[PDB]
Amino acid sequence: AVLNQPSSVSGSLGQRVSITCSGSSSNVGNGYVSWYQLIPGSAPRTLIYGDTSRASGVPDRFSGSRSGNTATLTISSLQAEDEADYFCASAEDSSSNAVFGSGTTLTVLGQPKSPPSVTLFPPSTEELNGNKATLVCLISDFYPGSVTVVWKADGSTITRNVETTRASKQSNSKYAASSYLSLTSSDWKSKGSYSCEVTHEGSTVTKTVKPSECS
């Protein structure tokens, strides 16, 4: 089984936020639900066990409850550092068999919007000596955490040999991504300019490099 959680939940700072976890009599209805907090780059952290008991080090603003086949994790006063994924869990049919919830992403509202900074690096001489050319488009300090990237050369859109990462949270709570255009040294030299156009919340920031004018 998989426990039913809402995919997402949002709240503003200081608010009360709740995340439900609905299952069957054979899992949640068994009366020993646990909850885990997952933040990227960290191991999971146990928050609640046995429906209602807080694990060690867990702030009082976290509490759990259960009503029949639905458990609830409540944060009574939402804080910035509560942004995370939350998973419920329960034993099923056996104490050594655990089923998890589908997980809930909790967004804390009110983070200021921020446009991306973009740096576009041309291929290095050393790489070109190897007959390869990678153009590196580095995108940082944006929020919310989604961009779309378009590559161009002499006004034509490029799709082949482009790979773009997902957006990942930086230490300052804004987001970063990068996009790579992998060309041969010959292809690199064969265009007048290449551009990385990064669109974010309707606004586009463009950087350009010109082979004939690059060192």
Partner: protein, 263 residues
Amino acid sequence: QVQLRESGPSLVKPSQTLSLTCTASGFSLSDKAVGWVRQAPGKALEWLGSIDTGGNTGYNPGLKSRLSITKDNSKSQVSLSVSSVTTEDSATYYCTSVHQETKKYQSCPDGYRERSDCSNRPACGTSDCCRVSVFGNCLTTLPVSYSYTYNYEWHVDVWGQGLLVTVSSASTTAPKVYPLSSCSTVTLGCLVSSYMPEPVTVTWNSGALKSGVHTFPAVLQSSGLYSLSSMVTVPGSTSGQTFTCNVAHPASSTKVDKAVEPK
């Protein structure tokens, strides 16, 4: 608390067996089990299985046929094996210390009454639960046995730090490291190109330069190899200085300190 440390290959080929080990050190009379949980990128946490002091194992029913969990007391180690892996088995694998308890209950179902609560004997032979009449007294006929119910308790008490395992046909490959320079503030970078498996480490100036450094998560290219970049912004005042990007890729025994210069 119990100390958990995962070990094993970070890279395995499809159809091979993934073998991991955990050393679990702590109170020798601990009644926690040691279990394995994984999370594949973009997916939920997933239970694999556990083993306890008594040697009792339990598994995710859906995965059981592919899993084997054993222990070796002499090495303080619990082992996990996942057979015939595919890329679906790429995940962070966590060793965990697990609470596991079972509580069993017996009750008499509705319309019946525990025989000891009846008055006259023999209330309904020697059966567990006598039938209750409309008037609300015990009847001798058609008694039932107890309904038995079990309440299962599971939770993770301690999480290991996890081990990322990638299942790929790509072989271990050392990166090529290239200096990046643009065409009052200068921005320098290093490209760590085409390596396998993760991770690599990048510092600047042998660790001395930390401020203004941004190292980006890796991209996976169609070749099946990773690339990542790091960049640093420094005051144009310091342009006369020498800058280096220190790259290490332990998997391929690669260690490079790359000089990076404005063009």
